[PDB]
Copies of this chain bind each other. A is one copy, B any other.
């Protein structure tokens, strides 16, 4: 398998993304896509083509997402998809990096459910969840462990889950916490909804590729680690051109300005592949802020997804 060569030859990247989740991957009226995971797709396209528009988006629901990657319909799956051992071992898939560390939570309507302030008060609740998710299984674990009753209402379409929760048919919504922010913004009265404090699982969102093509996994992995290194070194969409002439050898090396460097070409890309990425989408923090952080209606704090040296878990492996 040589996915990179195939991608170069067709001139665009085919990406599996969400059907519609605000902040992460959502289309406008014209079918134009934006979001955190979308920008990660555009980052890979930027690394390869120097053009973040060279992407074709395939929206996938929770049940069809893995099949679409296995069959080669999409080249990469970037779609709030949790890295787990069973997905790593039993599906013929690998993970090239974690672009967002999350965890599972519960959301309620505070006007309808007065006095509920903890997930441990939800015994008896009807709770909507989607089939084909970690979410369904973790909820079962949590309620069993805490000796609570519950009525799972299982959906195949996110639109149906959203509707059943918003109508009051379901008392609570469960999914990844960052997704609850996005779901909330699509409801009738977003301000009425409270994400409860409990986080009941680890949900590291993975950059998902097929096994058996290390060169392709390398390209995806190092696009991610380039976004991280760029933010750590203060390299932005706005200054990256200027940063090519930096005195800092780390920065010079990252941006392909070093004498006889072979980093980009060993990866199968051009020497200035990181310049292309950062011009295309900015660094990791810029992607975060415009889509799900302070530059967005979601206002999610960096938290676990801060840089490693600022208290977070996001650690750019060295471009060395």
Interface status of A247 (Cβ within 8 A of chain B): yes
Interface status of A304 (Cβ within 8 A of chain B): yes
Docked-complex contact B249 and A89, CB < 8 angstroms: no
A146 to chain B, nearest CB (A): 10
Other-chain contact of A304, B201, B225, B250, B308 (Cβ < 8 Å): B308
Other-chain contact of A320, B82, B214, B267, B319 (Cβ < 8 Å): B82
Residues in B with CB closer than 8 Å to A293 are none
Residues in B with CB closer than 8 Å to A141 are 249-250
Give A262 to B201 CA distance when docked, in angstroms.
Answer: 20
- A144 and B85 in contact, given A101-B315, A137-B320, A315-B313 (Cβ under 8 angstroms): no
**Per-residue CB proximity of A144-184 to B under 8 Å, as 1/0?**
11000000000000000000000000000000000000000
In the complex, residue of chain B having the shortest beta-carbon distance to the beta carbon of A267: B89
Interface status of A113 (Cβ within 8 A of chain B): no
Interface status of A266 (Cβ within 8 A of chain B): yes
Docked-complex contact A202 and B82, CB < 8 angstroms: no
Q: How many copies are assembled?
A: 2
A119 to chain B, nearest CB (A): 15
Interface status of A189 (Cβ within 8 A of chain B): no
Interface status of A272 (Cβ within 8 A of chain B): no
**Per-residue CB proximity of A176-208 to B under 8 Å, as 1/0?**
000000000000000000000000011110000
- A94 and B315 in contact, given A304-B308, A320-B85, A320-B86 (Cβ under 8 angstroms): no
Docked-complex contact A266 and B145, CB < 8 angstroms: no
In the complex, residue of chain B having the shortest beta-carbon distance to the beta carbon of A218: B89
Residues in B with CB closer than 8 Å to A225 are 85
In the complex, residue of chain B having the shortest beta-carbon distance to the beta carbon of A101: B315
Give A8 to B244 CA distance when docked, in angstroms.
Answer: 50
Interface status of A3 (Cβ within 8 A of chain B): no
Give A104 to B204 CA distance when docked, in angstroms.
Answer: 29
Docked-complex contact B82 and A318, CB < 8 angstroms: yes
A70 to chain B, nearest CB (A): 14
In the complex, residue of chain B having the shortest beta-carbon distance to the beta carbon of A147: B247
**Per-residue CB proximity of A210-252 to B under 8 Å, as 1/0?**
0110110110011001000000000000000000000111100
Residues in B with CB closer than 8 Å to A83 are 317-318
Interface status of A53 (Cβ within 8 A of chain B): no
Interface status of A296 (Cβ within 8 A of chain B): no
Interface status of A117 (Cβ within 8 A of chain B): no
Give A23 to B145 CA distance when docked, in angstroms.
Answer: 40
Give A218 to B215 CA distance when docked, in angstroms.
Answer: 17
Interface status of A263 (Cβ within 8 A of chain B): yes
CB within 8 Å of B: which residues of A? Answer: 82-86, 88-90, 94, 101, 134, 137-138, 141, 144-145, 201-204, 211-212, 214-215, 217-218, 221-222, 225, 247-250, 262-263, 266-268, 304, 308, 311, 313, 315-320
Instruction: Sort A-B residue pairs by CB-CB distance and give the 7 closest, nearest first.
Output: A141-B249, A84-B320, A211-B214, A90-B266, A89-B266, A202-B318, A89-B267
